[PDB]
Amino acid sequence: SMDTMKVINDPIHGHIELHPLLVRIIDTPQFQRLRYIKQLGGGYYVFPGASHNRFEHSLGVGYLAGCLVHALGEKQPELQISERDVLCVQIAGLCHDLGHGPFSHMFDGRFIPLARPEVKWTHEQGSVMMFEHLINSNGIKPVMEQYGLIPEEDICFIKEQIVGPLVEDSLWPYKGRPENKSFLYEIVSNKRNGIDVDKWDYFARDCHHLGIQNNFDYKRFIKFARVCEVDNELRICARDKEVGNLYDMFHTRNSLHRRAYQHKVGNIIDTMITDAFLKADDYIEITGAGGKKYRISTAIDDMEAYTKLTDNIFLEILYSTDPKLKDAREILKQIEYRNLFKYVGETQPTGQIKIKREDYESLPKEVASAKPKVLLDVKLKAEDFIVDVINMDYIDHVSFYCKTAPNRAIRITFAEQLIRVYCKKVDRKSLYAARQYFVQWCADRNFTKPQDG
């Protein structure tokens, strides 16, 4: 007794039972912070239903993580899955997104690169740092001990699930659990086949809020799921008949990626918000540890300050009166009036090296420096250009099993990067010149000839 599981009523998963340890981790300012970070960032300004935040999705990931590890233990007891392992996997699923910043992938994937090109920051490292901070700012280690967890090993295990291994030895890299349980590291985030409960939840939830049909049935997948040995390595395998379900999922994956995550106006609005943040970064102060004041771009260095870095920043800019924020405020005002940056074109580095984040800040200048062979009336500044780099995760690298051979696999034996360009000046002459500069840049970088007309 002492404590009790609690029921949360979610529109995707229904009744969610939660072990009291998970509840103690949820009822913390560090976790509740996720109620104020919209899942799809600026997608909301394009899809009215995309009001949802990382908090809901995180609960869903935790629930799905628990369901799947429990099913594998029930079906295959030989794996030695313990209730402790279950709890650790649920905690990892709950906290995999603790580190996101205002407007989710906008922050670590565009803003920090443009604000601090020398820094290498990702939301996953942020999640591990935030998790540590949540453990220590509240009293979570003794509760872990109260429910059987070994904080040293299990904290390591949870963090390793979130960010990966600490290494070319080809020996077992992880230390939080041994290699005999390697498959548990494939539950919350899987890079091999991209089948994890994180994508299950955000595929379902983003379809629910976007009005997209989703025919993937994750409960049916969990039911017919099983661990099997493929290439002397224990992996999560799927029943041979379940391929149809997997088709339905990958089609959902494409429909979400093409219709939403790569929405032209959605991404333009993301970069407009990034422009405001940059034009506000020097004047916005966030109080962190020891009273020290951090900026939007440096909050990630102090978890106490980052705990208060949220979509709120947007309205903190929009509602301000300080003349120093006038620049930033005005950009957000254009978003409200729907006077957006205008789309110039799209290209891909097909065949070429991929653009790195450290070079994002240099791209506008390159574009403005491109010399069209037809000399132009209007001349444009690097400040007049936005260069948007869109990366994508990524038929079947999924391990299967035969209905009678559940121990071994069957043995069966789009793009990685887009580059769009937007212009801040909107007169037809300026936009014509933008296109000229842009085509010439794609030729200079040996990128694919844009074909927008």
Instruction: By CB under 6 A, name the one of 79, 230, 234, 265 that touches ligand A1BHL.
Output: 265
Question: Which member of 51, 136, 350, 407 binds a second copy (CB under 8 A)?
Answer: 51
Q: Which of residues 185-214 bind Fe ion (CB under 5 A)?
A: 198
Binding mask 280-319 for a second copy (x = CB under 8 A): ------xx---x----------------x-x-x--xx-xx
Q: Among residues 193 and 417, whose Cβ is nearest to a second copy?
A: 193
Residue 195, number of CB atoms within 10 A of its CB: 22
Which residue, chain included where needed, has tokens 């003349």?
323
Task: Confirm if 112 and 121 have CB atoms less than 8 A apart.
Answer: yes
Instruction: Tell whether residue 365 is among the known ligand binding residues.
Output: no
| Positive or negative torsion for Cα 282, 285, 288, 289 | positive
Q: Do residues 93 and 190 lie in contact, with contact meaning Cβ atoms separated by under 8 Å?
A: no
Q: Is 301 annotated as a binding residue?
A: no
Of 82, 215, 350, 407, the one binding a second copy (CB under 8 A) is 215
Selecting among 19, 52, 123, 209, the annotated active-site residue is 123
Rounded to 5 degrees, what angle do the CA atoms 356, 362, 364 make? 115
Instruction: State the binding string over 87-126 for Fe ion (x if CB under 5 A, else -).
Output: ----------x-----------------------------
| DSSP letter assigned to residue 447 | P
- 129/286 with CB nearer a second copy: 286
CB of residue 314 to Fe ion, shortest distance in Å: 21
The residues, ordered by sequence, that sit 6+ positions from 419 with a Cβ below 8 Å of its Cβ are 346, 347, 348, 349, 355, 387, 388, 389, 390, 447
8 A C-beta contact, residue 446 and residue 276: no
d(CA 153, CA 55): 26
Report the nearest approach of a second copy to the CB of residue 246 (Å). Answer: 8
Active site residue 257: no
Residue 247 interacting with a second copy (CB under 8 A)? yes
Query: Does residue 8 touch a second copy according to CB under 8 A?
Result: yes
> CA 196, CA 184: separation in Å to the nearest integer?
11
Write the DSSP string, 168-213. ---S----SS-GGGGGGGGSS--SSS---HHHHHHHHHHHHHHT--
Question: Contacts with ligand A1BHL in 181-200 (CB under 6 A)?
Answer: none
Encoded one letter per residue, x for contact with a second copy by CB under 8 A and - for no contact, window 108-147 reads ----------------------------------------
The one among 22, 40, 53, 176 contacting a second copy by CB under 8 A = 53
32: contact with a second copy by CB under 8 A: yes
Element at 369 (helix H, strand E): helix 363-369
User: Residue 191 or residue 428: which is nearer to ligand A1BHL going by CB?
Assistant: 428
Q: Provide the Cα torsion 53, 58, 60, 63; round to 10°.
A: -160
Tokens of 193: 């086949």
Distances in whole angstroms, Cα of residue 77 to Cα of each of 70, 82, 130, 188, 199: 10, 9, 34, 21, 26
Minimum CB distance to a second copy, residue 354 (Å)? 30
Residue 55 near residue 35 (C-beta atoms within 8 A): yes
Which residues, other chains included, contact 124 with Cβ-Cβ below 8 Å and sequence gap of 6+?
96, 99, 162, 163, 164
CB of 311 to a second copy, least distance (A): 9
Enumerate residues 339-358 that contact ligand A1BHL by CB under 6 A: 340, 343
Q: Which helix (H) or strand (E) holds 386?
A: strand 385-391
CB of 189 to Fe ion, least distance (A): 8
Work out whether 243 is an interface residue with a second copy (CB under 8 A). yes
> Which are the catalytic amino acids?
123
Binding site for a second copy (CB under 8 A): 2, 8-12, 14, 23, 27-29, 32, 35-36, 44-45, 47-49, 51-53, 55-56, 59, 208-211, 215, 217, 220, 241, 243-248, 251, 286-287, 291, 308, 310, 312, 315-316, 318-319, 321, 333, 336-338
Binding site for ligand A1BHL (CB under 6 A): 4, 6-9, 23, 26-27, 45-46, 48, 211, 259, 263-265, 338, 340, 343
Binding site for Fe ion (CB under 5 A): 97, 198
